[PDB]
Ligand binder design. Structure first.
Ligand code: ATP
Length: 719
């Protein structure tokens, strides 16, 4: 053969047509730094063969090219801007040489073709795909942008409108959409893919297809009028501004460069893509978004290891079938594991089966599941009032009232209606698992399985290990949590566990701000519009319930009297005593009127200000820095203690718990990512100003040691 590399090879085939195959040593092919180089040597061989009449690009793997190697991304983000620009300029010169070959080219695209993989197939003149194709440029989801001609070829291939939507939103289209749009020239089955991708090629060599007329639009300015240009780009700039006033600069950057690079050739369009990819690759957001992907692949990787030799449970059950019970029953049955949902009255069983069917109805809305086959999974949910079928279940969760007496009572009973080797789980929001373990005969089959509202939207399943929770029981809990399409995390037992434990000091600092005379309406503004929380402290406290927060603040105070007990009377107490419980009864920090569709909207109350002035000092204007610091320091100080105390295993698990459990802003990456993005020693000097407010603002000794040398929590890793 002509050229053989570690990840790809090149050989003659058929009748004077070459064949470049991406055959990586692993399971998926990626355009890593070596593969881009190995491609450069392969194309150069094609440039010195006078007998060349055709070129075919294909893959021996299930997919085509998964993309660039993300394990190199954090290292690529660190090289200086000039060096990264020069490399990207010459990495683009590789694909330009693929595109400029004096020969009809085509890529037989199979399976996935994301990121650099799609940018590769755009260089060829023709593209032929398979019915299982998924193709797109999801580079803005990681904070960067198409760097290998994606923002140049796709706008000139698909028309500006369709390319702006794919690139900015970072989406991938299917086999049917790609042909309709223009990404794909034809769809054939994988068997006929290799042969069919040479039939289209030999139409081109015999002059039937004008291939350099099809190649030409990718080299020329966009065929858009001034009126069409301004129209097309405000739709993209408007659809990007739709996404909640982004702190994310990647989607708007990707759009604005394609706009600036319109009416330009391929050289300047690649130049404007290059000059904007490098600054994006250096943004703290791009590091945090890529760090989330690697941490996600590590969390789910650790999942397969714990669950490597434990069979998944076949029959499941939930105890507590309200809205949360319907979500737990839906999510388990919707992914192939039956459920047994039981309450104490039928009005909750209907309300649970109702909610469980609404979630399936949304799957019927689009991405349709067969309504005939939709009934095949709600029929898998059985609303029982007695203990029917509990003999034939393998695991069960308790999603009952937040009350230790009822939890211990209903756990010891359902234990008796259930076999010995069967596993029990608890969705307690705050009660420690080791305490509930004393009310069971077989504690070795009991642990904490903790969902988060909204259950279907928040994918974290906080899994807590009791003192006698064995290792086999947790693997069964992690196995079921994974099969439900949920991202699980294992923590050690303590009151509040990790997610709800670190969130309370965030609330305590909110009560301490209001006590010092702050405005809860502006505090919610700063935490939502600037830090990026989906909901600020006060608004969130109303959807948790002012009394649920009032009760949870008492549980966390008896568990951590060292530093989680307050001396004064706060907003949570004053609001609770006025029977204002939040969105629950429509009265809380705000007033919640029913809107037209039924989504309660927050409107201001007059009696809430006069009620807060009793528990507060005179109104004091705090800066956004004071608000952000006084709200975030007690939380991150807590997530660090959960690391040193062994509650959470690693910084990667803690950040994924915050991102997927509390909706921690992904562009911040997490508390530890934010703690590394900010100066590790700078954090102590920032926190020393507020160290006198309470023991929560006192940085733990472990971080106080690392702040001596500005030591981070994420070690710089190799790929
Ligand atoms: N003694 C009990 N034994 C078993 N289950 C119970 C008991 N009391 C309540 N439950 C169940 O616990 C679930 C939640 O109870 P409930 O509706 O009282 O929630 P809640 O915590 O009071 O919420 P809110 O305070 O917002 O109304 C319900 O499914 C209910 O059937």
């Amino acid at each position: 053969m002509l050229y053989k590399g570690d990840t790809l090879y090149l050989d003659w085939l058929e009748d004077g047509i070459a064949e470049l195959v991406f055959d990586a040593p692993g399971s998926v092919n990626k355009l890593d730094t070596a593969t881009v180089a190995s491609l450069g040597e392969a194309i150069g061989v094609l440039e010195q063969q006078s007998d060349l009449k055709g070129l075919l690009l294909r893959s021996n793997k299930a997919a085509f090219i998964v993309g660039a190697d993300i394990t190199e991304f954090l290292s690529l983000f660190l090289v200086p801007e000039e060096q990264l620009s020069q490399w990207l300029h010459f990495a683009n010169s590789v694909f330009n040489r693929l595109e400029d070959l004096p020969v009809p080219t085509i890529a037989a695209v199979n399976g996935y073709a994301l990121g650099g993989g799609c940018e590769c197939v755009l260089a060829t003149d023709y593209r032929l795909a398979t019915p299982d194709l998924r193709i797109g440029l999801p580079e803005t989801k990681l904070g960067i942008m198409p760097g290998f001609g994606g923002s140049v070829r796709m706008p000139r291939m698909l028309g500006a409108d369709s390319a702006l939507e794919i690139i900015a939103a970072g989406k991938d289209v299917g086999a049917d959409q790609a042909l309709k749009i223009g990404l794909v020239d034809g769809v054939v089955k994988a068997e006929k893919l290799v042969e069919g991708a040479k039939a289209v090629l030999r139409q081109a060599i015999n002059g039937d297809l004008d291939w350099k007329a099809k190649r030409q639009p990718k080299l020329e300015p966009l065929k858009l009028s001034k009126i069409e240009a301004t129209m097309s780009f405000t739709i993209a700039k408007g659809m990007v501004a739709q996404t909640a006033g982004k702190h994310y600069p990647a989607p708007i950057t990707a759009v604005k460069t394609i706009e600036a690079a319109a009416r330009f050739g391929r050289e300047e369009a690649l130049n404007l893509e290059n000059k904007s990819f490098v600054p994006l690759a250096h943004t703290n957001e791009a590091r945090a978004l890529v760090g989330i992907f690697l941490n996600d692949q590590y969390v789910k990787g650790k999942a397969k290891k714990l669950t490597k030799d434990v069979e998944t449970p076949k029959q499941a059950a939930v105890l507590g079938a309200g809205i949360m019970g319907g979500g737990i029953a839906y999510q388990s049955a919707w992914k192939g594991v039956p459920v047994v949902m039981k309450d104490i009255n039928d009005k909750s069983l209907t309300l649970g089966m109702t909610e469980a069917a609404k979630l399936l109805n949304k799957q019927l809305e689009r991405g349709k599941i067969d309504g005939l086959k939709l009934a095949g999974v709600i029929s898998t949910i059985h609303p029982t009032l007695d203990y029917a079928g509990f003999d034939r279940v393998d695991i069960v969760v308790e999603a009952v009232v937040e009350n230790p007496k009822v939890k211990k009572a209903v756990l010891a009973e359902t234990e008796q209606k259930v076999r010995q080797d069967t596993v029990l789980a608890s969705n307690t929001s705050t009660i420690p698992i080791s305490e509930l373990a004393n009310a069971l005969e077989r504690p070795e089959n009991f642990c904490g399985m903790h969902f988060f509202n909204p259950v279907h939207r928040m994918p974290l399943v906080e899994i807590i290990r009791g003192e006698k929770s064995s290792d086999e029981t947790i693997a069964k809990v992690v196995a079921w949590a994974s099969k439900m399409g949920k991202t699980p995390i294992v923590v050690n037992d303590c009151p509040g566990f990790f997610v709800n434990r670190v969130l309370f000091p965030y609330f305590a600092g909110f009560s301490q701000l209001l006590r010092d005379g702050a405005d809860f309406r502006k505090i919610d503004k700063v935490m939502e519009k600037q830090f990026g929380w989906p909901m600020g402290p006060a608004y969130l406290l109303d959807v948790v319930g002012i009394d649920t927060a009032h009760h949870a603040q008492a549980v966390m105070a008896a568990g951590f009297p060292q530093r989680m007990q307050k001396d004064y009377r706060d907003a949570i107490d004053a609001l609770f005593d006025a029977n204002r419980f939040g969105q629950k009864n429509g009265l809380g920090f705000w007033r919640y009127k029913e809107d037209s569709k039924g989504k309660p909207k927050k409107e201001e109350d007059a009696a809430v200000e006069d009620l807060l002035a009793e528990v507060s000092q005179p109104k004091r204007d705090f800066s956004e820095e004071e608000i952000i610091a006084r709200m975030m320091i007690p939380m991150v100080n807590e997530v660090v203690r959960c690391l040193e105390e062994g509650i959470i295993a690693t910084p990667a698990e803690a950040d994924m718990a915050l991102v997927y459990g509390l909706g921690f802003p992904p562009f911040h990456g997490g508390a530890f990512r934010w703690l590394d993005t900010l100066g590790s020693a700078k954090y102590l000097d920032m926190a020393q100003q507020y160290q006198h407010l309470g023991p929560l603002y006192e940085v733990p000794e472990g971080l106080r040691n690392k702040a001596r040398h500005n030591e981070p929590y994420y070690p710089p890793v190799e790929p």
